[PDB]
Amino acid sequence: SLDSTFERLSKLQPTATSCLAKDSESLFNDLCSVFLSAAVSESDLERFDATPVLSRPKAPSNSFYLSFYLRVWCGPYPTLAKVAALERVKTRLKEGDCVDKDFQAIFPYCIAALSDPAKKVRRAAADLVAVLGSAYKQLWAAKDLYGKTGTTSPLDKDALKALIRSVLIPCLEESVLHEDHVVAALVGALELSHSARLSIFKFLCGHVVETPLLAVKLRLLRSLNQIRRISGTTRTDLLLPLLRWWAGLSANEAAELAAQESVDVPAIDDAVVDVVVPNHAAGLEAFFQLVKEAIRPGLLQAIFARIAKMWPSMKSDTKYSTAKTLFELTQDPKLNAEQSDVITEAVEVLRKVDLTTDILHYFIDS
Amino acid sequence: PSLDSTFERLSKLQPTATSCLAKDSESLFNDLCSVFLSAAVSESDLERFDATPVLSRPKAPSNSFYLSFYLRVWCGPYPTLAKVAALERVKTRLKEGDCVDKDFQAIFPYCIAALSDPAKKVRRAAADLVAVLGSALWAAKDLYGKTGTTSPLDKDALKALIRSVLIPCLEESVLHEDHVVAALVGALESHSARLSIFKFLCGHVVETPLLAVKLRLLRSLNQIRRISGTTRTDLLLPLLRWWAGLSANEAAELAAQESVDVPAIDDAVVDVVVPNHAAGLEAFFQLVKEAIRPGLLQAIFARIAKMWPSMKSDTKYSTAKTLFELTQDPKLNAEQSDVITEAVEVLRKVDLTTDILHYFIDS
């Protein structure tokens, strides 16, 4: 109409559950449908922004208002709406009531938005990071942003000033220029402070585990995954439950979440499996456990292929151990009865890899 | 008197028909050769010697001794002037219409071997001799004792060797020590005279006692897997068998005698076997199961390795099964043989197939 729908939304109940949370799913789509039509007019854009369920005067108290737009960018929605959303939050956070709460939990989504292909979106997330950075020079949605939990390992003060001032703000311009430059920049940052790399690292990783946005997981992972270790803690040591969650869900379940965000299941499989580092005993065990349990085939494939890629940098003795398991796996009575593809995939690992003298003696002696 | 004492001592020695490229006439050859190396520097002593009655000019070709002596001297660890002297003595001895009735083709291997010589003087002297041999069967069953030229060249095949490959690349081979082997390879790579030349060359390589000539000729023969249905392996296998038969003593000794290296031989002998040769690879496995010199062992396995990528699809499986079979052999395991270790080195170095791996697992 579009005011008839605007009035339908007028009589709507404000809430505190975030949009990045389970309970508010049915609400979000409804609002989001309207936003996709309202965002073409600055007039209707304000109409929408203003209806009381969004609760502009309740962000930062509420965690609803910002969460809605976070989710609208980083979502399978056309460019002008991702821009519009980034702007609604950009201008809304300059208002003054907002200089007492922290809002660090937005940076994952800005970081994500800077990997976006649309030039206008990268510039919009750039501007938004600038405003977020001017702020300090406590925590918004600290435990409610995804419903049950929020920002799991918060960012330290020195780590925050290092995130903004050392890694985030200096790379904005080239990040607007090169759709790829963000992952490169963020990796080259966490590989400027010694313990700030660690706190930024943990912070990013936790948000990657906890969001429902597969898209955010991927974009953050394009960079986060290409970091083997930082001061005694491996990225696997931080992200392994992401792998256990993703592996556990059915083919339906994965196809369905992926469809909802219009992302490709294989890309997720690859990204999830890339969480495990070479000489990580527990990550390897998780791999072997997960393949013994019934799982999506593309995931099975992705896991074994990862074991292969991991093989060259596997140390000598864990190489032997991985061959022992692969062998025993070929020899397992239950999988043999199933004639599962686990056998064939395992033998393919044993082909494609460069074996060692010791492994060969294992093969000979039984 | 330059050499009168020695020449009178050689006078009293009785000529024989057992050839120099044969077994028994060893100390005799050594003796004659020692004197020759000193006699070859003076034309006076060269002629005194050439004439000595035990050499038995002009009884060659009645007697296979005279020509075999100088043959053995080109292809020996002897100074340049002595090899040239021998090449010249045979050229001169053979332009003499005394010999226009016998066929001296059994000399061509030794010329070919001689044109690979580094010293240019030797190369051109062998050039002279190839041309003189070209203007025109000697020792056919005698040159090496029990056998001679085991597979000879027909009329068309011999004229093909002379006019087609030898004499046209002759001058460039005198300039370049390399152009000989190259010329012969690019020659066997006419038909099917190629095959008769091939058999002929190989027969002399198997049969000669001159490891140096075996090598020099193999530098070429080994560069040819097959031509018109016959594998070089099928022709050279008894060489491999003989050579594997030798003790470390005998190989080091024979090698010393000609001043060639046991390893270079190990290499050339083993490359005799082409990849997809059932009987040759089978021979390898038999030989390694028997006692052999380690250098040969290393070389045999090293060869199986190199041969692997060209092993046919199924033959990879069968031979990997065989290698495995060796590693599990209890008698060798008690010996803690180096065969086991070299086999596992093969099974490591090689790209396996799913079928081979399943063989390993179901083991």
Automatic annotation (TrEMBL), chain B:
It is found in: Nucleus, Nucleolus. Belongs to the HEATR1/UTP10 family. It comes from Chaetomium thermophilum (strain DSM 1495 / CBS 144.50 / IMI 039719). This is U3 small nucleolar RNA-associated protein 10. Involved in nucleolar processing of pre-18S ribosomal RNA. Involved in ribosome biosynthesis. The chain holds residues 486 to 872 of 1802 of the full protein. Coiled coil: none annotated. It comes from the Eukaryota. Component of the ribosomal small subunit (SSU) processome.
